[PDB]
Design an enzyme around this catalytic site. Structure first.
Site, mmCIF file in Angstrom:
data_model
loop_
_atom_site.group_PDB
_atom_site.id
_atom_site.type_symbol
_atom_site.label_atom_id
_atom_site.label_comp_id
_atom_site.label_asym_id
_atom_site.label_seq_id
_atom_site.Cartn_x
_atom_site.Cartn_y
_atom_site.Cartn_z
ATOM 1 N N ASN A 87 0.974 -1.171 -0.135
ATOM 2 C CA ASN A 87 0.172 0.038 0.105
ATOM 3 C C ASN A 87 0.939 1.194 0.001
ATOM 4 O O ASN A 87 0.499 2.151 0.641
ATOM 5 C CB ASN A 87 -0.867 -0.019 1.241
ATOM 6 C CG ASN A 87 -1.865 1.165 1.173
ATOM 7 O OD1 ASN A 87 -2.126 1.948 2.474
ATOM 8 N ND2 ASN A 87 -2.379 1.796 0.208
ATOM 9 N N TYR B 127 0.134 9.253 -11.429
ATOM 10 C CA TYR B 127 -0.281 8.127 -10.459
ATOM 11 C C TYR B 127 -1.082 7.060 -11.229
ATOM 12 O O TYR B 127 -0.879 6.002 -10.716
ATOM 13 C CB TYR B 127 -1.300 9.014 -9.336
ATOM 14 C CG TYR B 127 -2.018 8.196 -8.610
ATOM 15 C CD1 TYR B 127 -1.027 7.592 -7.182
ATOM 16 C CD2 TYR B 127 -3.315 7.728 -8.686
ATOM 17 C CE1 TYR B 127 -1.798 6.662 -6.286
ATOM 18 C CE2 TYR B 127 -3.931 6.995 -7.477
ATOM 19 C CZ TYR B 127 -3.189 6.527 -6.558
ATOM 20 O OH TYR B 127 -3.863 5.788 -5.400
ATOM 21 N N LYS C 28 -0.484 3.052 -11.286
ATOM 22 C CA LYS C 28 -1.167 1.969 -10.944
ATOM 23 C C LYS C 28 -1.348 1.028 -11.936
ATOM 24 O O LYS C 28 -1.849 0.064 -11.865
ATOM 25 C CB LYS C 28 -2.532 2.859 -10.520
ATOM 26 C CG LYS C 28 -2.380 3.614 -9.197
ATOM 27 C CD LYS C 28 -1.428 2.672 -8.057
ATOM 28 C CE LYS C 28 -1.268 3.393 -6.761
ATOM 29 N NZ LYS C 28 -0.757 2.674 -5.693
#
Lengths: 237, 237, 237, 237
Positions: free
Chosen positions: D92, D148, D152
């Site tokens: 995470n 980002y 991902k």
């Protein structure tokens, strides 16, 4: 022919896909900038363009490392200097963490950096961007190419993102995910028939045709941010 | 021109997409079978073909219900009779359970039934199939078109399935998922700019160009079983 | 236990997945309606529930054809009569055009019809819907199951559509796409290891656990309209 | 409780998702290693674990930069030293090219580096890996989060790739793509209802439950390499 009065930059054009694309676009009347780190391989591309009967004035050869700021600037500065504008950009560039770094630097970082620099000029001509990805990226696993695949997955996402952002500046962005391509016994031919539904190996020219399709508004203007798979059906198996 | 000596059947060609596709293919030299239930709308398509300067001999008009066994047979029998063969099939056909039945019957059932009948002939010419779907089908919700969307989702799956099975018979199968298309104030223009990244509404001709691209091996031979989205970027929002 | 004071209808519960799901939910305290056309197979499910120590009062067995209006009404009427409400609906129901019709009627039509009838009651309890699909549906070809796969592809789309529409009525909708599942030599074991990355065959119970996960807001409330693949990794190969 | 005798490392556990996950797993009996660069935020996580009644002996707090080789080694060395083994790893962790570099370094590079180091130990316990991605990655555009999102997207591909490769070593790998999550007027509440079909904002705990589901073989053993979307339905709009 289409692409007449159009100027295109084709990275990774010293071989295979990139080379066939440069020859096709040149034959179509475009003014092309080919580039790569291997001067001899690149000149070979130039020779195929000349052999096709294209004037040497329509070809700009740039030997450079597309991963460096200077290489990028040289690629762009020489194209604008010799041709005065930029209409098309075909981004065809491209285990230990070191291999990860090298792989992402070339396949993702350099594409983003070069593209950002090209944007202003592409906006002026309401140009086109065609990102070359790979079926290595998709809703499946690709263990034999751990870093190449994830870099391409980022390329796919990057394509969707930039397509939406850049279309506001009159720029069309799309990507192509080629399957197996060669030309850049009985047992091997059998396996081929098994792994590629098409029954025939993909050719650099097959991919070039699709790149041209996406770079030509007359044939694909309403296609935007799409990931066009060109793999003879392989990814569907 | 491409499609010279090629014979194509275009269903749902009495309007919009189907009509523009028929005109394009005809102008490209193909021998086309147009069909629909509304004779007057269909004749209008024929007139646009003739107006384009195409010989009336290259057009076969079939008024029929593509959802019926007889309509299907008539569409196919008249094309083979007048043209002798079949190279291309563009499947462009297309709340209470009753609406569900009608919707699936037209958008899925009739396409499967017609295609199965065409297969033998398409195999002979190593033909092409282009299924027209819709972005109504995709990895998102489409509540305003409950049954149309799921029928198209089945069309997408059907396209992938048949592409793999039929390529063994020399037939290439692909599909296209069009976004918003018109031509078949300030507030409306604003919303349009907002809902369609392209900033311009899709046109029947825009879709026709992509259908032609996929029906032409010279430009897309290595593309197989792909769902080509043509939506000005709408589905990416 | 979870599902205490909850009432669930599980279609196709006379065997495999459906049966294991009914036993699991019952063991979890829910009041379950099992149903199918084969009374003996269905009773076998009931017996496994009783054997698990569950009171016979918590089981409602309905022998009926879920494809018929009457079967559907019976399934629903008996559950509301005996249990007074409905919290969970697990839709686990489920070549020539005839096979196409039969396949879609069972796998798609009956699910839509039953669901529409259940909606009012599910809204009252802010219930859950779990649609059982299959990896037969996905971004790949499934030639061995031509109609089953496209029906499931429609189920996936239907799940996304209804999830968005029904959440406005307090109902959560999701779907599960199971891979290979058994229990409902050396050469076969080898191939298994090759076709299922997990290295072990899926079990009815494995799927039941995931259905329970999605039917329980305490564990998945924020998951909505998702197609949860449970295939030991098979679809990724 | 589940996770009894299990040891888990949760990166980015100094806040929101990571913090809620650490508290949940700890409450479930697992021996957890929390980590982050902000010592005070991390201690706050520890305090919530203690407040839940968990023994301080079951918590290993590591203040470190997960992007560095030393941080990674410290995170892993202290967990193996204090707990003796590793069962679960919850990854995470996580415009100018500089922002690109920083973003990919944290969201992709560090995850790959840490995971490679954990693999040997996860193989020993036939452990689990749960990669936290984001709906920023998906078949759509995400212009507000340019780097980002692509990082991902690479995480999703990486998850699929490693799931297939690592399952051969007894390790299960999956990922979760959370939508909007808070808690880590009338106009804002209205927009919320509009942007999140669920009608309620996601909570750190909602994501934690799904992470636990995927880390527990008793509930998800047959789920492998899947990208589980947990977004209240947002990505479907």
């Amino acid at each position: 022919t289409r692409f007449a009065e159009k100027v295109a930059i084709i990275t990774g054009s010293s071989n295979g896909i990139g080379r066939a694309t440069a020859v096709l676009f040149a034959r179509e009347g475009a003014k092309v900038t080919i580039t790569g780190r291997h001067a001899e391989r690149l000149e070979e591309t130039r020779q195929q363009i000349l052999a096709a009967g294209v004037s040497e004035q329509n070809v700009n050869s740039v030997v450079a490392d597309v991963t460096t700021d200077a290489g990028q600037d040289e690629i762009l500065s020489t194209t604008l200097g010799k041709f005065g504008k930029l209409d098309i950009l075909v981004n065809n560039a491209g285990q230990s963490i070191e291999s990860y770094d090298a792989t992402l630097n070339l396949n993702l970082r350099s594409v983003i950096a070069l593209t950002k620099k090209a944007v202003p000029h592409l906006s002026s001509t309401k140009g086109e961007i065609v990102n070359i990805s790979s079926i290595a990226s998709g809703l499946h696993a690709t263990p034999d190419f751990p870093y190449y695949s994830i870099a391409k997955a980022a390329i796919d996402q990057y394509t969707r993102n930039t397509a939406i952002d850049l279309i506001q500046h009159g720029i069309r962005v799309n990507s192509i995910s080629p399957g197996l391509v060669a030309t850049g016994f009985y047992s091997t031919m059998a396996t081929m028939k098994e792994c590629v539904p098409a029954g025939v190996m993909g050719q650099p020219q097959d991919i070039a045709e699709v790149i041209a399709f996406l770079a030509d508004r007359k044939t694909s203007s309403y296609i935007i941010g799409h990931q066009l798979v060109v793999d003879g059906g392989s990814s569907l198996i």
